[PDB]
Design a protein around this ligand. Structure first.
Ligand SMILES: [Mg+2]
Ligand SMILES: [Mg+2]
Ligand SMILES: [Mg+2]
Length: 820
RNA sequence: GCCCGGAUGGUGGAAUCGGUAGACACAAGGGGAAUCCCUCGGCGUUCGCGCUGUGCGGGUUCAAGUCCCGCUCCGGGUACC
């Protein structure tokens, strides 16, 4: 065993071992319990950032841990390889998106391997390859045939392909209740995004107008407070008035281009319940695309109605009582909360629900209103006018008819060998490309490409069967691996990717491809990585941001930063810990830290510094701390093994001191197990390891028994660290002569006999304040404990000439003397 | 505007059915570039501890960081639906 811990001489060798033995390659083995650990796949931008490194270390800890529990563990990696940044970079260099993307993939793959992530590399997928994307093309034609796909022109105004995500709104919404191991925050974000709303449509007669106008409201209870209506710029009534009104027409034209603003339509509606004529405005805040593109306005109780009404001198009418039953102060703003009606005729005194229902019922029976459920969720627009994405498998015949690309022309291959002219997709600018023949007649194949969210919506599934032809999924394999047991990635994907992949899963279920409703049991959103951020003010008044690496700080007598400078001598202002970024120049390159300290130190720091789901504060000093710890583990194993083999441990003949150390070993095992497997607090797991290492470093190692005990502890410690720092642990395991490769060694289980106490610490309070802590035989009786407490000078001091009124006793733990 | 989080030493961050607050680590200063034995919330100390202490106020309980009421401050999403 080398005396010196040398990451550079260890890490690449173990890594090569992992590849040579294919250690982390798995099959669909029905005789084992499966566990699918998934991290969100990276975009091949060029290098890993610190967030990839946190995301994938978390995944790797879990995958290696679960393997040591004896599970069959799938941990796959791949590349979300289509998308915009490649087009930018293709043009910026003298190049094409594909070769730039493949270069980034090789470079980043080598970084992942240098970090020693235990992936099943045989399952590796890159989404820009025809072998991957042909399947989403095929599935898209199937989706179209199921009636879930349609073309339509829309804002972004351009034609687009949509997939009917609204056909699954209620399922996406209901099934959120099945997801207890998703965080509330992500669930609430998807709820609001889907935005199912229960309301009322209300129809008005309009003077000098040969239609009726209908609005949608979620607060029909406030309808007696309605003083005007507001319609979207692009509403048929708004257009009918503009015909004779240059002001209005001017306004409508504005509302397309680049904040309460509107115009008086000149039309008057009759309020169906008061008979009063009310104005109709065109207004900027009203979406033509939602509901009916028109609202009834109630300034007294809708904040945006309040602002609009004030601006244009429209009536503000109160109809909701305050929470305390008093008529609302509307001098400043609207009363938003739902309360009892007043000033609403027949509906006065009704509470919120009763009023909602009475007014709905009334307007229904009058035939000018009905209940109506709307959704904020729009259909999913999957089309882009972009080159670097998977072609959309549709064609147009000469007769005009749109249909899917015939099965025998799939995939539709994106040509990789192209030259970007910056502005037009090569497959657009060459009018030859589109030309095809369908049933031996000329057709034009679609020229738009898929939204990149298309590939990331089903990759997690394809990982189960990456080499399968015949179909998108081999069901047997997919149903074996799915659902994902834990999915680790950022909360920022909450209402894009994390919604799309639930939807796509349901689409694949409903094509018979899988047999479960939800793609992922647990979702873990890891916190952001923060770093210190500094800037100075140039003599031009411009803020110049200086990397915290480049900052020379100086500290008071307690270590607070109080003054700082860069090398050039500028005065820096410390702005605290902040999200890593190019704007603030506080990015840290993981590769530099891997090359400086070895991957194990980097990984250990990032798991130690902070619970997975909280923000992590990057500190060079914490990293050097982690590194020194690893040297202390290396040293203690060096010293222990330098003395050769050990006798078998005799557990019956241990000193009270030995029993105590061994109890601490096994309690640590229990605690680390609980922390990693149930609580998922990896920071406290690691702290328990360090704490134990500190004790082990202080224990004697001369006697045969001390050495046997040290062997047992080191074999446990080395396994406990292994999911965090597997390169050093793999090596140390061999030094200790552990059986086999550590990657397939069993996770240590705590020995119950080792955890038994002969003694217990009893905390002694007097009137609830700690006056002593006594060690007593583990089964001492309450009388024995009391007697011992009263023999303590520290306690007796507070019993002297005062009377014990009563005692509270928690067996073997606490005695409080109430006195007196 | 809501939706949660949160607030504990000089800093990060513990405390898992209320029962030894501050584990673990960093900074820092100090003793014997790298290493080990310490010390370390505050005040006081006869070194045994005493008082005080988890954002402020109050309640509950023999006992509150942890439960309940009310403040004050703060981070991060996110809206004309
Ligand atoms: Mg924690
Ligand atoms: Mg504080
Ligand atoms: Mg506790």
């Amino acid at each position: 065993m080398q005396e010196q811990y040398r990451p550079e001489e260890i890490e690449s060798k173990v890594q090569l071992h992992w590849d040579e033995k294919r250690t982390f390659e798995v099959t669909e083995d029905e005789s084992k319990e499966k566990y699918y650990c998934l991290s969100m796949l990276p975009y091949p931008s060029g290098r890993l950032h610190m967030g990839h490194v946190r995301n994938y270390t978390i995944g790797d800890v879990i995958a290696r841990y679960q393997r040591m529990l004896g599970k069959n563990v799938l941990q796959p990696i791949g590349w979300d390889a289509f998308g915009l940044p490649a087009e930018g970079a293709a043009v910026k260099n003298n190049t094409a998106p594909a070769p730039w993307t493949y270069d980034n993939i090789a470079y980043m793959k080598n970084q992942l391997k240098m970090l020693g992530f235990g992936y099943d590399w045989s399952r590796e997928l890159a989404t820009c390859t025809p072998e991957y994307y042909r399947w989403e093309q095929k599935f898209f034609t199937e989706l179209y045939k199921k009636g879930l796909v349609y073309k339509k022109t829309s804002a972004v105004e351009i034609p687009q392909w949509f997939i009917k995500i609204t056909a699954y709104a209620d399922e996406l919404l209901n099934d959120l209740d099945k997801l207890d191991h998703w965080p509330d925050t992500v669930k609430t974000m998807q709820r609001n995004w889907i935005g199912r709303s229960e309301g009322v449509e209300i129809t008005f007669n309009v003077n000098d107008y040969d239609n009726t106008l209908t609005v949608y409201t979620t607060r029909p209870d406030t309808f007696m407070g309605c003083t005007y209506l507001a319609v979207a710029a692009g509403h048929p009534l708004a257009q009918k008035a503009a015909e004779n009104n240059p002001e209005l027409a001017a306004f409508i034209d504005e509302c397309r281009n680049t904040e309460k603003k509107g115009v008086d339509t000149g039309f008057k509606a009759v309020h169906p319940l008061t008979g009063e004529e009310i104005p109709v405005w065109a207004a900027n805040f009203v979406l033509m695309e939602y509901g009916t593109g028109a609202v009834m306005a109630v300034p007294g109780h809708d904040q945006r109605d309040y602002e609009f009404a004030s601006k244009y001198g429209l009536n503000i009418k109160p109809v909701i009582l305050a929470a305390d039953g008093s008529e609302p102060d509307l001098s400043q703003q609207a009363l938003t909360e739902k309360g009892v009606l007043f000033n609403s005729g027949e509906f006065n005194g009704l509470d919120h629900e009763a009023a909602f229902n009475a007014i709905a019922d009334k307007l229904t029976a009058m035939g000018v209103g009905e209940r109506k459920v709307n959704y904020r969720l729009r259909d999913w627009g999957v089309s882009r006018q972009r080159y670097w994405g998977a072609p959309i498998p549709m064609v147009t015949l000469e007769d005009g008819t749109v249909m899917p690309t015939p099965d025998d022309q799939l995939p539709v291959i994106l040509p990789e060998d192209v030259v970007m002219d910056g502005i037009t997709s090569p497959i657009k600018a060459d009018p030859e490309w589109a030309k095809t023949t369908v049933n031996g007649m000329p057709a034009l194949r679609e020229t738009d490409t898929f939204d990149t969210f298309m590939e990331s919506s089903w990759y997690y599934a394809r990982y189960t069967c990456p080499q399968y032809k015949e179909g998108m999924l081999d069901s047997e394999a997919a149903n074996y691996w799915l659902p994902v047991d834990i999915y680790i990635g950022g909360i920022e994907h909450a209402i894009m990717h994390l919604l799309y992949f639930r939807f796509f899963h349901k689409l694949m279920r409903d094509a018979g491809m899988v047999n479960s409703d939800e793609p992922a049991k647990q979702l873990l959103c890891q916190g952001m990585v923060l770093a210190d951020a500094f800037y100075y003010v140039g003599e031009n008044g411009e803020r110049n941001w200086v990397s915290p690496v480049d900052a020379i700080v100086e500290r008071d007598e307690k270590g607070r930063i109080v003054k700082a400078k860069d090398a050039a001598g500028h005065e820096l202002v410390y702005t605290g810990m902040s999200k890593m970024s190019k704007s603030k120049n506080n990015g840290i390159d993981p590769q530099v830290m891997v090359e400086r300290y070895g991957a194990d130190t980097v990984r250990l720091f990032m798991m130690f510094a902070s619970p997975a789901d909280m923000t992590l504060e990057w500190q060079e000093s914490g990293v050097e701390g982690a590194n020194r710890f690893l040297k202390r583990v290396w040293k203690l194993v060096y010293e222990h093994t330098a003395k050769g083999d050990v006798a078998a441990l005799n557990v019956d003949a241990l000193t009270e001191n030995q029993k105590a150390l061994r109890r601490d070993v096994h309690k640590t095992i229990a605690k680390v197990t609980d922390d990693i497997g149930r609580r998922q607090t990896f920071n406290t797991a690691i702290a328990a390891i360090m704490e134990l290492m500190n004790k082990l470093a202080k224990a004697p190692t001369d006697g045969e028994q001390d050495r046997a005990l040290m062997q047992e502890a080191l074999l446990a410690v080395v396994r406990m660290l292994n999911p965090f720092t597997p390169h050093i642990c793999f090596t140390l395991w061999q030094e200790l002569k552990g059986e086999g490769d550590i990657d397939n060694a069993p996770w240590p289980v705590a020995d119950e006999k080792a955890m038994v106490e002969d003694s217990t610490l009893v905390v002694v309070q007097v009137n609830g304040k700690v006056r002593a802590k006594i060690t007593v035989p583990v089964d001492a009786t309450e009388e024995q404990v009391r007697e011992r407490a009263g023999q303590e000078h520290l306690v007796a001091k507070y019993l002297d000439g005062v009377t014990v009124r009563k005692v509270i006793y928690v067996p073997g733990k606490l005695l409080n003397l109430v006195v007196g």
